[PDB]
Design a protein around this ligand. Structure first.
Ligand SMILES: O=C(O)CCC(=O)C(=O)O
Ligand SMILES: [Cl-]
Ligand SMILES: [Fe+2]
Length: 280
């Protein structure tokens, strides 16, 4: 059984060990934090993307057409699936940070507001990681799901098995990463985050040839309702923060003409749990 807290952003300082409780204690699995950003700010940013006065965000839009017409588009490169050098990732990350700061117009600033939230929920400093040669990681990416598009089932801790994670693994604790995201725009129907009770299990995955054959068996448990699940659909400006590192999750197919737009990434403890890093 998955357990998600629901509070308004005004209350976050009353939960100073929430991130510790999700990752280490595992007394619960996620939170909906209502109104981290005002509705007007979300609309403003959405309009920037739609009109094109987006601080150069459209210059780093990846349509992902090579992976079919059934997948999310993404502004900025997400680190998952990148080459170990991260050269393209770092280039797009710098642009993403610029454009994001421009669009939010400090009302409130995206990075400041998100860092404020994570700080309140942990009592710890919060930082965007720096690359081997001083490059900035991106704090977030924006995912765009048009009508009929979805995000296939996956689990966050698989990132640790990817070459792209080489550098981050020198900075992060061994524990679970969390996912965080905030809708900019929400669809008419569908586009729900579905989290399953099925957990990350590298011992079972290692007893297969490739990940496609293992994921087929994971898919069979999901399609047969063997695993318990909960669906979430946070509103614009609400943050959804959960143990995506541990639990398999997906975003259901978008229904209607109105696209689902979400800004977010991941977070995890530093080696000594004296700091939180966040990135996408
Ligand atoms: O809906 C999103 O923006 C991303 C969903 C997801 O897989 C995650 O938050 O880790
Ligand atoms: Cl994930
Ligand atoms: Fe995810």
């Amino acid at each position: 059984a998955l357990h998600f807290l629901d509070i308004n952003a005004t209350e976050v300082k009353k939960y100073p060990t929430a991130i510790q409780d999700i990752i280490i204690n595992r007394s619960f699995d996620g939170m909906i934090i209502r109104g981290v950003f005002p509705r007007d700010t979300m609309e403003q940013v959405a309009r920037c993307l739609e009109e094109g006065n987006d601080g150069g965000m459209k210059s780093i839009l990846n349509k992902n057409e090579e992976f079919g017409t059934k997948v999310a588009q993404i502004y900025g490169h997400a680190i998952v699936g990148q080459s170990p050098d991260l050269k393209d990732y770092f280039a797009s990350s710098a642009i993403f940070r610029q454009a994001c700061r421009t669009m939010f117009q400090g009302s409130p600033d995206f990075e400041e507001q998100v860092e404020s939230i994570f700080h309140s929920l942990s009592g710890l400093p919060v930082e965007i990681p720096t690359g081997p040669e001083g490059q900035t990681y991106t704090p977030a990416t924006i995912r765009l799901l048009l009508e009929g598009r979805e995000i296939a089932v996956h689990v966050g801790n698989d990132f640790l098995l990817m070459p792209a994670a080489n550098h981050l693994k020198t900075l992060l604790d061994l524990s679970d990463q969390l996912s965080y995201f905030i809708p900019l725009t929400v669809p008419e129907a569908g586009g729900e985050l579905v989290v399953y009770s099925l957990e990350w299990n590298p011992q079972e995955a290692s007893k297969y040839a490739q990940m496609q054959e293992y994921m087929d068996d994971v898919e069979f448990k999901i399609k047969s309702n063997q695993s318990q699940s909960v669906a979430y659909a946070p509103g614009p400006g609400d943050m959804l923060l959960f143990n995506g590192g541990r639990y398999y999750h997906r975003v259901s197919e978008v229904i209607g003409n109105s696209p689902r737009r979400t800004i977010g990434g991941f977070l995890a403890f530093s080696k000594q749990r004296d700091k939180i890093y966040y990135w996408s």
